[PDB]
From a paper:
BMP-9 and BMP-10 are TGF-β family signaling ligands naturally secreted into blood. They act on endothelial cells and are required for proper development and maintenance of the vasculature. BMP-9 and −10 are synthesized as pro-proteins and processed by furin to release growth factors comprised of two cystine-knotted protomers that can covalently homo- or hetero-dimerize via a single cysteine in the dimer interface. Unlike other ligands of the TGF-β family, BMP-9 and −10 are secreted as a mixture of disulfide-linked dimers and monomers, in which the interchain cysteine (Cys-392) remains either paired or unpaired.
To further understand how these residues contribute to growth factor dimerization, BMP-9 G389S and BMP-9 G389S, K357R disulfide-linked dimers were crystallized at both neutral and low pH. For BMP-9 dimer mutants at neutral pH, the well solution was 1M NaCl, 22–26% glycerol, 0.1 M HEPEs pH 7.4, and the cryoprotectants ranged across 25–35% glycerol. For the crystals where the datasets were split, the integrated diffraction data was split using rebatch in the CCP4 suite to take either the first or last 32nd (or first 64th for wild type BMP-9) of diffraction images from each crystal’s 360° datasets. Where the serine is present, its sidechain hydroxyl is unstructured at neutral pH. Since wild type BMP-9 is radiation sensitive, the BMP-9 mutants were checked for radiation sensitivity. At neutral pH, the mutants lost density due to radiation damage but remained disulfide bonded. While neither mutant’s disulfide could be unambiguously modeled in a strained conformation, the radiation sensitivity demonstrates that the bonds are not ideal. While the trend is not clear between mutants at neutral pH, the damage is decreased compared to wild-type. Swapping the identified serine/glycine residues was sufficient to swap disulfide bond formation frequencies, but not equally. The interchain cystines in the variant structures reveal decreased radiation sensitivity with each additional dimerization contact.
Numbering used by the authors:
A (entry chain A), B (entry chain A): 325 to 429
The structure:
Amino acid sequence: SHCQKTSLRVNFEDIGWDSWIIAPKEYEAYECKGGCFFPLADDVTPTKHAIVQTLVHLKFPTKVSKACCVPTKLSPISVLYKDDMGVPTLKYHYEGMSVAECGCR
Amino acid sequence: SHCQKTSLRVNFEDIGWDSWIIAPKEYEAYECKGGCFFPLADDVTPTKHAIVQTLVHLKFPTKVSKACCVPTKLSPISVLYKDDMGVPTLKYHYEGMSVAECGCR
Ligand SMILES: [Cl-]
Ligand SMILES: [Cl-]
Ligand SMILES: [Cl-]
Ligand SMILES: [Cl-]
Ligand SMILES: [Cl-]
Ligand SMILES: [Cl-]
Ligand SMILES: [Cl-]
Ligand SMILES: [Cl-]
Ligand SMILES: [Cl-]
Ligand SMILES: [Cl-]
Ligand SMILES: [Cl-]
Ligand SMILES: [Cl-]
Ligand code: NA
Ligand code: NA
Ligand code: NA
Ligand code: NA
Ligand code: NA
Ligand code: NA
Ligand code: NA
Ligand code: NA
């Protein structure tokens, strides 16, 4: 019930990227889901601002929003993409594609 | 109407920190507010995962949430705190307290 990494399988044609991504068809991107509320967990790595804003949200729930559970570290995947000549080319480390860690920010 | 930094003045007794923070009474913490939706802005620095998840949210709005507008860089403030001897001590760089930049994550 707190900020944590959970599964998210993404299909590239569902998001309109199949026009340039030949392969893979789908990959595990994960997502960060869960609440940022007190008491927090031991491993969500909360920033001081995320802690402060969550406290302000308690006192003023209609004015200030709470902190958000988001990726704090991302990992690459490899993709096979068509280049300007229609030739399948490998992008070995397409960065920023999969969640490695989540946290409250 | 997009991810951007906006004002947020925090009062320490409102959040229960006045028991250990003698001064200042209030500070400008800012907050990151705005939507992460297409078309994005030129300066929100979106990660590839935040872009992918926003596209998945369009196709499956009830299953996957959108990306979140969050601080991507924080700045310190100085605080005057009482130490274990009841003596006011200065913490020159209390890190992570104020928003320097926002972005979609
Ligand atoms: Cl806590
Ligand atoms: Cl911090
Ligand atoms: Cl590329
Ligand atoms: Cl590479
Ligand atoms: Cl390598
Ligand atoms: Cl890349
Ligand atoms: Cl765009
Ligand atoms: Cl990225
Ligand atoms: Cl301290
Ligand atoms: Cl310091
Ligand atoms: Cl200095
Ligand atoms: Cl610090
Ligand atoms: Na309120
Ligand atoms: Na609000
Ligand atoms: Na490219
Ligand atoms: Na390698
Ligand atoms: Na849906
Ligand atoms: Na949802
Ligand atoms: Na301390
Ligand atoms: Na200085």
